[PDB]
Design a protein around this ligand. Structure first.
Ligand SMILES: [Cl-]
Ligand SMILES: [Cl-]
Length: 162
């Protein structure tokens, strides 16, 4: 299993603009287009992202291209972050993927807000980090995905995704 296959399980793949779990216009493999309620503002962000007039539809290649870009940015974003980088550096390969996942979903700011849980991950207190991670709007809004990510943090294996 790898980061790409893990996020592809968490986000699915859709080739037409859709609304995410929060009601925002998205396309592809969890690629947020905009928070505006305007569908037209979404189609425009899309064309700009793809460099062609799509009319709200993209191909599998176009979806994967945005995905590659998004994973890369999530990683680069964690490495540029004074609060996230140290955590990431402290973790093993599997758990590093769990952190990329949270950042891909909620952005670097959001994750940097998990202050206490980050400190626990760093100290390798797995059970206690998992309990804290669960006391969050994140967990209450997207419980099945949160549980998978949390179990990944707790065990250091891909069991939740297998
Ligand atoms: Cl983009
Ligand atoms: Cl969920």
């Amino acid at each position: 299993m790898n980061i790409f296959e893990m996020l592809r399980i968490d986000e699915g793949l859709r080739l037409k603009i859709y609304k995410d779990t929060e009601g925002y216009y998205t396309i592809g493999i969890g690629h947020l287009l905009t928070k505006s309620p305007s569908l037209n503002a979404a189609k425009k962000e899309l064309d700009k992202a793809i460099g062609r007039n799509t009319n709200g539809v993209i191909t599998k290649d176009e979806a994967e291209k945005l995905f590659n870009q998004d994973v890369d940015a999530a990683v680069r974003g964690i490495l540029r972050n004074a609060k996230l980088k140290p955590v990431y550096d402290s973790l093993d390969a599997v758990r590093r993927a769990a952190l990329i996942n949270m950042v891909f979903q909620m952005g670097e700011t959001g994750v940097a807000g998990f202050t206490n849980s980050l400190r626990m991950l760093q100290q390798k207190r797995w059970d206690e980090a998992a309990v804290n991670l669960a006391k969050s709007r994140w967990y209450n809004q997207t419980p099945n995905r949160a549980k998978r990510v949390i179990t990944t943090f707790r065990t250091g294996t891909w069991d939740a995704y297998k």
